Amino acid sequence: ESRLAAQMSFVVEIDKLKTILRQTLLTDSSRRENDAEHSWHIATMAFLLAEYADEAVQIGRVARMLLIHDIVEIDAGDTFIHDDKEERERKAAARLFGLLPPDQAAEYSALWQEYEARETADARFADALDRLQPLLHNFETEGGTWKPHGVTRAKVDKLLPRIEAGSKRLGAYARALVDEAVRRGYLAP
Amino acid sequence: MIPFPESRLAAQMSFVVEIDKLKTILRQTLLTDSSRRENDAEHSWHIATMAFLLAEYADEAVQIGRVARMLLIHDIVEIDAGDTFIHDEADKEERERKAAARLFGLLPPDQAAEYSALWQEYEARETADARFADALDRLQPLLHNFETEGGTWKPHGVTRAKVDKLLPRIEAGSKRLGAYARALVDEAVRRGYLAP
Ligand SMILES: [Ca+2]
């Protein structure tokens, strides 16, 4: 009974990801986005946008990776990308994934490590989607996150190679979006 | 001005942007700390993650990645149709059919049909994938009600008899998860979280 008990303890504990607030507001500006609903959104993108991945990418695995990528933030908190972290997240991973049975603890902690390293095919596609989504959001909200955080083209352009690493097509989309964003005054030069 | 060859990707992105709105649709399930109601997007995150974690309890014929995808999209229709509490008897079919047409209709035609069908499959709870998806979706609120000491059950007058009507849906996806769920509900009744 202790295997399922451990699994259920993890399922219950990770509810707390819903409480971890990002700097992003929702597209309706009503409230801050949380980590759990953000991971839902990116994971959904992995399936919708699967055709743009390299052939080696395992889309279901990318989805699983994206669903678990921010679990460490339960203990480590959220940091805005444009603003100790590694150590806090390592400790978080040990405690949180440590709730699982040992096989799954090792599997999921390694899958999270793999996401952070952004080396493998799956990790690059995952990371590309995660980096793409705030561009889509910011364009839709006329710079709703960029403006209140004083984000510049320099800081955004620096992240574009991460999208390109996951998909040349999505990279090209992102570049055109950023240029038009600056044109329109959504993003400071 | 989106050139004609960019049409497919633009349609896909229009859907990606639109579905932000799922985050604003609230359920009656509380977070485990009773701090607020759960929203549909974070609910779908949670159940899709459970699909992967609890995969070993699925029938051999289930494709777990497909279950995950199905769960990620299963509530998109609620953007337009809203949430309906499972025990609330009082046009849901028509609302949801119209929602599906508008929302999935943002996608390119191949994916509009694909994703609509996948949602329909989930709702029908006939296929192996749909049964496992539905079992996970029905288990999670039980977990939360146990954590919140009947934080949804009591205010809504939910009784053991009403919950017992739902438990076979869990059993239909996994006998082991069904047994867990029944034992959890037995304990909830003993603790007074759930009217007998
Ligand atoms: Ca509930």
Phi, psi dihedral angles at B191 (to 5 degrees): -85, -5
Sign of CA dihedral A54, A56, A61, A65: negative
Q: Give the rounded distance of the alpha carbon of B140 from its chain centre.
A: 9
DSSP letters, A89-104, are HHHHHHHHHTTS-HHH
| Pairing assessment for the beta strands A32-34 and A21-25 based on DSSP bridges | antiparallel
What residues of chain A lie within 8 A of the CB of B16, using their CB? 41, 44-45, 48-49, 133, 136
Distances (CA, A) of A75 to A67, A85, B68: 17, 11, 26
Distance B88 CA to ligand 1 centre (A): 11
Q: Does residue A170 contact residue A52 with C-beta atoms inside 8 Å? A: yes
Q: What is the C-alpha separation between B180 and B154, in angstroms, rounded?
A: 21
Q: What is the C-alpha separation between B106 and A99, in angstroms, rounded?
A: 41
DSSP B5: G
Domain total for chain A? Answer: 1
Per-residue b/e over B52-80, b at no fewer than 16 CB within 10 Å? bbbeebbeeebebbbbbbbbbbbbbbbbb
Q: What is the C-alpha separation between B48 and B71, in angstroms, rounded?
A: 6
Residue B143 contacts A, CB cutoff 8 Å: yes
Residues 6+ apart with CB under 8 A from A81: A134, A159
Tell me the technique behind this structure: X-ray
Q: What is the C-alpha separation between B173 and B125, in angstroms, rounded?
A: 10
Domain of B92, CATH number, reads 1.10.3210.10
- Domain of residue B14 covers 2-196
Q: Does residue A26 contact residue A144 with C-beta atoms inside 8 Å? A: no
Residues 6+ apart with CB under 8 A from A20: A34, A35, A36, A70, A73, A74, A77, A78
What residues of chain B lie within 8 A of the CB of A130, using their CB? none
Distance B92 CA to ligand 1 centre (A): 18
| Residue A22 host element (H or E) | strand A21-25
Q: In this complex, do A49 and B23 lie within 8 Å of one another by their Cβ atoms?
A: no
Q: Name which of A24, A40, A58, A71 to mutate to probe chain B: the one with the most chain B Cβ atoms within 10 A of its Cβ.
A: A40
**Alpha-carbon distance B113 to nearest alpha carbon in chain A (angstroms):** 13
What residues of chain B lie within 8 A of the CB of A63, using their CB? 48, 65, 68-69, 72
What was the resolution (in A) of this experimentally determined structure? Answer: 1.4
C-alpha closest to that of B123 among B102, B99, B88, B142: B99
What residues of chain B lie within 8 A of the CB of A41, using their CB? 16, 19-20, 23, 41
What residues of chain A lie within 8 A of the CB of B33, using their CB? 15-16, 19
Residue in A with minimal Cα distance to B57: A4
SS3 content of chain A, % helix, strand, coil (to 5): 70, 5, 25
Q: In this complex, do A47 and B13 lie within 8 Å of one another by their Cβ atoms?
A: no
**Alpha-carbon distance A42 to nearest alpha carbon in chain B (angstroms):** 9
From chain A residues 76-135, the ones with a CB under 8 A of any chain B CB are 100, 104, 133
From chain A residues 148-187, the ones with a CB under 8 A of any chain B CB are 169, 173
Sign of CA dihedral A5, B127, A38, A164: positive
Residue in B with minimal Cα distance to A40: B45
Would you call A147 exposed, middle or buried from its count of C-beta atoms within 10 A (0-12, 13-18, 19+)? middle
Q: Name which of B1, B12, B17, B20 to mutate to probe chain A: the one with the most chain A Cβ atoms within 10 A of its Cβ.
A: B20
C-alpha closest to that of B65 among B54, B85, B51, B81: B51
